[PDB]
Amino acid sequence: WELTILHTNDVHSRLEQTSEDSSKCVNASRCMGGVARLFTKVQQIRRAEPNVLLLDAGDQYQGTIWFTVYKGAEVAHFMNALRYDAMALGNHEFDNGVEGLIEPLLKEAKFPILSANIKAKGPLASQISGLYLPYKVLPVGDEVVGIVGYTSKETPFLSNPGTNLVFEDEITALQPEVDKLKTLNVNKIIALGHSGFEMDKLIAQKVRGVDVVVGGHSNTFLYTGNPPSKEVPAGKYPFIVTSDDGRKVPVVQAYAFGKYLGYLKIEFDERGNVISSHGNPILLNSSIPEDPSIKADINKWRIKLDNYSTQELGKTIVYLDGSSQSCRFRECNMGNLICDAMINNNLRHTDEMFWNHVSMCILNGGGIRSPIDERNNGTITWENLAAVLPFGGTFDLVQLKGSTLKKAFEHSVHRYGQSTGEFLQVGGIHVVYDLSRKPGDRVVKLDVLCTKCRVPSYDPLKMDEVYKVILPNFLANGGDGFQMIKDELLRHDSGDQDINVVSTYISKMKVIYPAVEGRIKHH
Amino acid sequence: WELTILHTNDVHSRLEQTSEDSSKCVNASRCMGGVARLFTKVQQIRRAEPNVLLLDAGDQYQGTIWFTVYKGAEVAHFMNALRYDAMALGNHEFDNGVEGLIEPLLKEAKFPILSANIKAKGPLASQISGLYLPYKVLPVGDEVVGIVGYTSKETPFLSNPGTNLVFEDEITALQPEVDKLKTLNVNKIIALGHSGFEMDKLIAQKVRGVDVVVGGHSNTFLYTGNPPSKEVPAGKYPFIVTSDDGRKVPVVQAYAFGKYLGYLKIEFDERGNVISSHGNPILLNSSIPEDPSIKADINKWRIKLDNYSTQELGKTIVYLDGSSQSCRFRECNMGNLICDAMINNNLRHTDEMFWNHVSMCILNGGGIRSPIDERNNGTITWENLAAVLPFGGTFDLVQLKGSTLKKAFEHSVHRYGQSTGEFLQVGGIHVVYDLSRKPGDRVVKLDVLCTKCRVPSYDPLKMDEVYKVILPNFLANGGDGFQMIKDELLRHDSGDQDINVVSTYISKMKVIYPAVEGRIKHH
Amino acid sequence: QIQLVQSGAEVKKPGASVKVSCKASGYTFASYNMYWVRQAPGQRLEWIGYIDPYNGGSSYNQKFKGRVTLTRDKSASTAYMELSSLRSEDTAVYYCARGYNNYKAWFAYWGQGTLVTVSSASTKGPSVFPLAPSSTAALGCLVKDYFPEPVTVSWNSGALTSGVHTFPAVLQSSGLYSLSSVVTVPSSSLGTQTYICNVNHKPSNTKVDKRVEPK
Amino acid sequence: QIQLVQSGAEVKKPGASVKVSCKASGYTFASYNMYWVRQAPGQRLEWIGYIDPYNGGSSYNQKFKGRVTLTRDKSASTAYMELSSLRSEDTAVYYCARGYNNYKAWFAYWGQGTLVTVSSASTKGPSVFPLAPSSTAALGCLVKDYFPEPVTVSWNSGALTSGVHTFPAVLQSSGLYSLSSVVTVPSSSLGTQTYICNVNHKPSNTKVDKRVEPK
Amino acid sequence: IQMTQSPSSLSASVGDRVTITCKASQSVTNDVAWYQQKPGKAPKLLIYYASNRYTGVPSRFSGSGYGTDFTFTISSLQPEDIATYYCQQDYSSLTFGQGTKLEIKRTVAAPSVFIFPPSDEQLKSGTASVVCLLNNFYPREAKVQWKVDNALQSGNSQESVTEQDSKDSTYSLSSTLTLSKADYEKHKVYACEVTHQGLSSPVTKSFNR
Amino acid sequence: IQMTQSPSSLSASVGDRVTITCKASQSVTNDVAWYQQKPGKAPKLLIYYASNRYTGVPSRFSGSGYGTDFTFTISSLQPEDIATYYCQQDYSSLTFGQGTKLEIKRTVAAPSVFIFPPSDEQLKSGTASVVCLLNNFYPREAKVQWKVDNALQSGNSQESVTEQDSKDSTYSLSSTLTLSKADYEKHKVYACEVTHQGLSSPVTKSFNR
Ligand SMILES: *[C@@H]1O[C@H](CO)[C@@H](O)[C@H](O)[C@H]1NC(C)=O
Ligand SMILES: *[C@@H]1O[C@H](CO)[C@@H](O)[C@H](O)[C@H]1NC(C)=O
Ligand SMILES: [Zn+2]
Ligand SMILES: [Zn+2]
Ligand SMILES: [Zn+2]
Ligand SMILES: [Zn+2]
Prior knowledge:
Distance between the termini of chain E: 61 Å
Largest sheet of chain E: 7 strands, mixed
Strand content of chain C: over 45%
Bound molecules: 2-acetamido-2-deoxy-beta-D-glucopyranose, zinc ion
Oligomer: heterohexamer
CATH superfamily of the largest domain in chain E: Immunoglobulins
Largest sheet of chain C: 7 strands, mixed
Order of helices and strands of chain C: EEEEEEEEEEEEEEEEEEE
Strand content of chain E: over 45%
CATH topology of the largest domain in chain E: Immunoglobulin-like
Number of domains of chain C: 2
Number of strands of chain E: 18
Shape of chain E: elongated
Structural class of chain C: mainly beta
Number of helices of chain C: 0
Shape of chain C: elongated
Structural class of chain E: mainly beta
Number of domains of chain E: 2
Radius of gyration of chain C: 20 Å
CATH class of the largest domain in chain E: Mainly Beta
Radius of gyration of chain E: 23 Å
Number of helices of chain E: 1
Helix content of chain C: under 10%
Order of helices and strands of chain E: EEEEEEEEEEEEEEEEHEE
Largest interface: C-E, 42 and 44 residues
Helix content of chain E: under 10%
C-alpha cells in the first residue's frame, strides 16, 4: 500500500508567487510558489496517485500584508480551496493570541488542526474544546492513517499564546497518543508538527509507533541529488533516523515560503510498517502554471492590499539581505540597517559630557523576516518593509549591566547551527565568537561604542558597568529565551513602532547602502 | 652678551584668538592666541629685555578664511604691525605659487624673508632677485646677529613652488652661508627654518657654526616642567643637541597656530659662544589682554569675512577631531566623515553586478587642517569647514592596482612618528599595521569593500586587481611623496570641489555623529 | 448570537417545487458551509446537501440527484433550498444547519424548521370555538376543520405559558385536522383576568383571536 | 607700471609753508611706505621722512624738528609733504620715493620732483630776444631778466632737438637770471626753414614764442 | 453507512443512570455526534467526536466509543431530559439514527377531569363537539368512555395525548365526542367516565343542554 | 652714519673700466645702494644690497663691498653713462653720498665760433647783449676774450657751459658781453677771440654796428 505525502511548512503569508528569495514578485517569469501554482501541482498529483495526503507543518500565519490585513482569514480560505487534509499548529499561529487563532483559522478550517502537546486551562478549556485535536484518524482509500500533531515547547517565548495554554514536552505528550492510536487498530502513523529538524529527529528516534515525521520551524531543506535552486540541502530527502526500537523512520521538511512542495512516496506492508521511502521537494517554478480560478480569487482579495503597495519610502542601491540563512547565522546588512535606524531614532540632546545617551543596539535575527530587492529602480515601499517587520512591535530603551549583555551574547549563539531566531544583530557593538568553544563561553571579544565621550570610539565591555541599549520590546519581555534581559534589566522605557522607525530612517537617508562591515566576527 | 629670542611657527592663518584646539573662538574668556594678544606679550618683553629678536619659522600662509580672502596680505600687514625681525620660508608660502608669495608677502614685508636652500632658475631668477635672501645680519644693540634661513627639501611635493625653484638639501646649502657669515666677523648665528624637528636636530648636529636652531613644520611642542595646556611635550625646552664638532646647540620650536610664544634666553661669551640657555613657550591665554589697537584693526579686516558664517550647513553631536595629533597618527572621526562624504558624492546608478562603481576612499592626514567643535548648538558653518579643507582642491576618481594601493599604505607609515602628512584616512578600507616592522613592510592586513557584489562586504586586497578609489587631486598628482599613485595609476578623472562635497554631505545628513570604528588598527 | 431564520410553512401540490429560505446572522455568512437536512414523520433525520456560500458550490445527497438545487444571496446572508417534482414523501420539516466549526457536521446551530406539506387536497382555514369553564379552573379553544398543518396557538399574545396544554392535531374522517389548546388557571381569577387564544395558520393566512368566557 | 606724480613748482616767502603732493598708481598705495627726500643745489640727497599710508604713522629726520608734517589721502592714493617756517636753505627739489620692496629704501620708484624756491624778492617775467645769425649756422634766444628759477625753452613746440644747447641760467648782479638757448642748423636752410623758440615761465605765467630771423 | 439505535424507547425514574446505544454499519472512527430533540423544536447538539461535550451541556451527559460501537449516558436522569435522542456519523457522507424516546417513571398521579359543552358559535356549522380534558396524570394508560345519556358511545370521539411534561412528568389527554346539531339537541345529560390507576373509582363528569 | 664718495669727479675714455668708491663712517653690512642721476631728472636705482643689480640695468654696471668699504664699477664706459653717481646706506637711518660726476675723455674737437649782434628789440630796455657761441668742442678748457674796439674787456661778460652729451661727448660755451645802449652805440667793431687745443691760432669772430 503506497501513500503520497504532499507537505508544506513555514508558508508565512506567501499567498502570491514570490521572487526566488521569497520577497515581492517583480519579474513574474522568474517567480515561484503561491497557492495558485501549488493548487495546480497538488491537483496533478491527486489525478496520478491513488492515495494522497496534503499536510501543513505550521507557520502559515505572519509574513506579508496579506496577514496584516486579513489576519488569518486568507489562510483558512486558501488552505480550504487547496483541500488540505490536516494542519499542525506552528508558533506563529499564536501571534494574534488564542482569540486570533480560534477566529478565523480554527472555526473556518475544513480540515483538522492538531497539536497534542498543547493543553488549555481555566476559562479557555471550554472555549477551545474540540477546535484543535491531539490527532485525527483519516480515511485514505480502503485504509486509515493516524496523524498526530505537535508544536514547539518554546512557543510561550516566541509568540503570544497567553497564560491558559500549557506547552508540554513533545516526546512525553506524543507517546500516549501514538500508543492509544495503536490500540484503536491504526498501524500507519504520521507525526506532523512544528518544533524544528533537531526535535523531529528526536521524535523519530524516541516516540515508539511513529512511522514518518513531517516537520517545520527550522526552514530545513533536504534533497536527494543535485538541488534545483539556491538552497543548500542540510541532508538527504528523506532523512533516515534509526529509532531506539531499531526501526528506520523517514524525517521530512520542505524548506519555507511555499517555494517547494514536499513529495514523499511511502510503501507500507499489510501491518503498517514502512518498506521503502523515496521522493524530493518539488520546485514550484514558472513551468508549473498558476491555477486560473485560484489566481482570479487571489486577485479579488489583493484589491484591499494595494493602498500599501504604493508610495516609495526611499531607495537602496544594495540588496537588503534579510534572509534567515544570513541574519540567523552572521552579520546581515538588513540587521545593520535596522540597528542604525534604532540608534538614529534615540538621538537626544543633553549633557556636554555625552555625545548621545545611547550608542548600543541589539536585534534578534528571528525578528528580520524578509530581504528587500534593489532591482525595481531601488524602491522601498511600506509593503516591502511590512514583510521585514510584520509584528507591530516597538524599539525600546533598556539599562543593562555588562554581565547581562555578555550573557545575552552567549545565549545568542548557545546552540548555533539550527537556524534559531535568538542570533543577535548589532549596532554600536563589535563582538567576536569562537563557536568551537563550549556554550556559555563562546564570546571571545566584546567591545562597545562609548556614550560619556565627545568622540565615539570602541572600548571593551565592563561587567559591572550599566549600558543603555535600544532593543525590540519582544527581547525586553524575555522573548527568544532572553530571560536574563527581562530579569536583570535596570530600567525599561517603551519606544516608537518598529516599522515607523525604519521607514523614517529610510526617508531621512533617501538613498541607503548598508554593508557587512565586521560588527560580528567568528574564526 | 644676552639675547632673548621670541619665536612663532605654523601660525596657519590664526590671526584671531581661537579655541584651545585652534578652531573658531566661541567662549572668548577661554580663548587663546591671535596677533592682538601676541602683540601685548611681545611689547611687554621688549620693554623688560634689552636685546630682543622676534622670529617666524614659516607656514604663516593657509589655515582659515583670512587666507582664502586676503591671500597673504593679512600676513604681511599683521606681521609688520608686530614688527617681526625676520621670517624663514615655510612650505605653505608656495600654496598660491611663486607669484602668490612675491605678491603680497615678499614685496609688502618690513622684515627680511629668508631661505638659503631655495635657488631660482630661468625667467624667475631676475623676477625674485633680492626679494628673499639666504641670510640677514641684523643689528641688535652694539652687536650683530646673523639669521640664516632654510625650507623643507620636500616642498615641491607638499606645495606649488613651480618648476623654476630648486630645493637643495638643507645641510649642504647652509654650511657655505654660515661659513661666509663667520668670515664677515658674525660670531652669533641663528638657523631659522621650516623642515621639521628631525631635520632641525640634524642641522644643529652637522652644520658647523650654528649657535641656535629655531624650527617649525612638525608642530613640535617642547617644554621644561609641567605644561600649561593639553599639548604633550616631545622633549625639554630647549632641546639640546651635541654637535659632531662637540658643541651644545639648543634646538627650539613653539608648537603651532600662535597658541604659544617661544621664549628662549641665550648668553654668549665675547667670541659668540653659547654659555647659557633656558626658556619655555608662553601660553597666550585670556590672562594676557589683546592689544586694543590691533583688535580694532583685526575687526576692521573681519567685515569682508562675515559672508562665511551667515548660514548653518548642518549639525554635529560629536566633536569632529581634525587635529594633526590624531589624523596624522591614527584613525580620526573627521577623516571618516570626509571619506564617507567622498563616497556618497560618487553614487552613480549604472548596471547591476556592481552596487556602485566605487567603494573605496583614501585621504592624506595632512589634508585635514582643523577640528570642528560641537558645543555652539552643534552648528557647522562654511568658515568652520574652510579651516578643515582650505586648499580648494578636488576629490578625484582613480584606477589603481592592488600593489599600487599596498605601496600607498606602506608610504603612509614608512617614517611614522614625525607628525608627517602622508598618514592615510580611509573609507571602505580596513587596514592593520605592525609599526615594529621594517619600513615598506609595515602593512599586515588590507581588506577592501567590494563593488562587483549586491551586498557590500570586505574581502582581502588582490595585488593584480584594479580598484576604483576616491582621492584628493593632490595625491593623484604625487603629493606628500605618493609617487607610486601618479606613476602607476591606470585612469584619472577630476571630480567636485573638496569643501563642496563635505558641505553637501552635512546638509543631506542634517545631523552627523562619525565615530572611530576600527578602519585603521595597529597592535 | 448565530441565528438561522427560515421562511414559514408551505403547502404544495404533487409535481410542484418549493423554495425554503434560511437567513443567517451573528457571523460572516460567506465563510461557513450551510447544511440542509429534513425530518419526515417517523422516518429519521435525512441529509439533503450543503453549499459553500462563497462560490455557490454544493454537494448533494444522491437520493435527490436532479431534484434539489441549493443557492444563496450573499448580500442578504440567505441560503436557498429548492426541491422540485414534489412527491407526498416530501411532506417533512426542512432544516438549515451550521456546524460548531467548518470541518465537521456537528450541528450546533439550526433553523426553526419549515414544514412542507405535499398534498392535492384543498387548503382550509380553521374555525376557532371557545371551551367555556363550567362552575382550579380550566378553559380552552377548539381549532376545528383546517388544512394543512401546522397551526400555532398562543394564550394572551404568547405571555401566558403556565398550565397551557396545546394537544396534538388529530386527522378526522373529512381529511381535516382538529386541535384543542387548553389552560388551567385559578377559579378566583375568572371574574377579572381575561383569556384570549391566538390561532395562526400561515397556509390559509388565518389569524383568529378568540375570547374565552363563562358560562 | 608704478608711477609717482608730484604737484608742480612752488615759490614761497621765508616764514611761509608749502604742501607738495605725490599721487601713486600701478600698486596698492595703502600697502607700502612712502619716502620723502630733498636735493638742494650742491648739498647732496637728504632724507626728510617716510609715512605708513595705512594709519598715517611717520618717522622723520631729526633735522626738521617740527616743521615737516607727512600726511595722505587714501581715497586719492596721494601722499602729502608739508614744510613750514620756510628758510632760504629749503630751496631744493622735493621727491617722493618708494622702495623695490617695503623692507629696504632701495628707491626703484621716484616722482619727477617738485622745485620749491624760498625767496623774499619779487616774481618777474622774462624778456625773450632773438640771436640772429651773421653771414654750419647758429641762431638762438636770449631769456633775460627773470627772478623765479623754473624756466623751459623749446625749439618749434618741442620737436626740434638736434643741435639745441639751452645753457644753464646765470645769476646777474640785479638778482635776475639770464639764460641762452642756441641751435646749430645747416646754412642752406636759413631761407627755407623757420625757427621759433618757445619760452615758458610758470611762476609769472609767461609764454613767449619768438621768431628768430636774419640779419 | 447505517446508524442503528437500540434501545429504541425506554423509561427510567428520576436520578437513574440511562445508557443508549448506536451501532454503525462500518467503522466511523470517533466521527459520531448525539442530539436531543423535543417535540416542536429542532435538535440540540449534545456530544461530538463520540465523547466531547458541546458548550453548555451539563456534565451528567456523556458519550463513548470508537468505530462501530457507540454509547450515550445520562448519569442522573432529570425531568428536563424528556426527549428523543439521535446519534449521527460524519465519516463517509451524513447519516442519522432512528432515535431513542426517553420517558420518565413517576409516582401515580390522578387526572383532574373537566367537561366542556359545545359553544353556540359551533351550532352554526350544524355539528357539535363536546370535549373531555384529563389534566396532568401518570401513567398515560387511561380509559375515556362517553355516555350520551346512559347509552355508551363506541363510534364517534377521537383521543389526543400530549408529550410528557418537562417539569411535572405527567401526561394530558383530550377526547372529543362529535355529533350533529340535531343528534346533540335530542339527548339531555352527556357524560365522560374516566378510569385510571390514580382513581379509586371511575370518575364521571357531566352536563345538560 | 656718513657716506663719503672718493673719486668726487672723473673723466675716462669710451669704453674704460671706471671704479668709484663709497666709504661709510661705521659698518653698514651690505645695506648700500647706487643710483645714476642726470641733470633735469630723478635718480635711477642701479645696485642694491651692495652687489645686487636692479632689473633692466646692464651687466657692465656692478657693485661690491661689505661694511665700510664699497665699490661701483662700469666695465665698458658708454657715452650714456654721463651722470652723477650716488651711494646710499639704509642700515641705521638713511644717508647718501655727496656724488661722483662722471665725464668722458674724447679726441680733441675744435669749437665752431659764432657772433650774435644785439637785437633792435633789446635796444628798447637801454642795454645791449652781444653773445659769442662756441659750439661742440672737447676739452671744456677754453678761453673767451672780448675786444670792444680793440681794447680788452675784463669786467663785463658772463660765461655758461652746457653739460657734456649722450652721443657727441662735446661741450658748448656761451659768453655774453653786456654794455648800455649808449656805451654800445659808441664803438664800431666788437670781437670775440677764442683760444682752444683744437685751434692752431686763436680764432676771432667780429661784427660792426
Ligand atoms: C523549473 O525547475 C526544473 C527543475 O530544476 C527545471 O528543469 C526547469 O527548467 C525549471 N523551469 C524554469 C522556467 O526555470
Ligand atoms: C594662563 O596660563 C597660566 C599658566 O601658563 C596660568 O597660571 C593662568 O592661570 C592661566 N590663565 C587662565 C585665564 O586660564
Ligand atoms: Zn517559521
Ligand atoms: Zn516556527
Ligand atoms: Zn605647517
Ligand atoms: Zn609645514
